[PDB]
């Protein structure tokens, strides 16, 4: 629906109390390649954790992606509990800068649960 950062922060936090969520920056989505360059570039920006084909990974020692397989990569910008604000509105701003203006929030506990997709437009 193309929200403001205030509006994004508000849909998160409108979420069941004490639920553990991760805020993600989509980097590359469903694209074949080894992505050695972005994976290297993300590490140099200072980030530590990423979600790579739906697994959480250390960006200091990434898994090796098969050349000929489709992969998707997201940075984990933040991990929080749902009670703040403030701090989240930053974390979103940051995520929106790593992708070109998208953000994704996912349940940490139940990976098959639905994800929230925000777009800054």
């Amino acid at each position: 629906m193309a929200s403001t950062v205030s509006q994004m922060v508000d849909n998160v936090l409108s979420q069941p109390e004490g639920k553990r969520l991760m805020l993600l920056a989509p980097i590359i989505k469903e694209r074949k390649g080894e992505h050695t360059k972005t994976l290297e570039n993300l590490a140099s920006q200072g980030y530590i954790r990423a979600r790579i084909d739906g697994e959480v990974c250390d960006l200091s020692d990434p898994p090796k992606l098969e050349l000929q397989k489709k992969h998707t990569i997201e940075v984990v910008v933040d991990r929080f509990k749902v009670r703040l604000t403030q701090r989240l509105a930053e974390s979103f701003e940051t995520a929106l800068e790593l992708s070109g203006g998208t953000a994704v929030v996912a349940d940490m506990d139940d990976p098959k649960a639905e994800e929230l997709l925000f777009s800054a437009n």
């Binding site: 980030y47 530590i48 984990v76 933040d78 991990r79 701090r87 930053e90 940051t94």
Partner: protein, 85 residues
């Protein structure tokens, strides 16, 4: 002094370092600087040989990692780090 699994306030720290004379930067390079990326706060204590990268899960410190200023990459974890007033 800061330990792994120690709870604390993100915004309290930030104004604190500001007053202690630390500089807020995009990227931590030398002494007396800190940086923020989401859950992460990079910090280079005045006098410390090595800079530190603190991973925040909500208000709790999940990990304290050393990192190299040039590569900006996380080295081995530490249990605690100290601070000068």
């Amino acid at each position: 002094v800061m330990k792994k699994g120690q709870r604390l306030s993100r915004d309290a720290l930030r104004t604190q370092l500001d007053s202690a004379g630390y500089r807020h930067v995009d990227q931590v390079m030398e002494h007396g600087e800190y940086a923020t990326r989401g859950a992460l706060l990079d910090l280079f204590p005045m006098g410390s040989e090595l800079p530190y990268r603190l991973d925040f899960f909500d208000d709790e410190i999940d990990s304290l990692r050393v990192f190299d200023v040039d590569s900006q990459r996380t080295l081995e974890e530490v249990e605690a780090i100290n601070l000068l007033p």
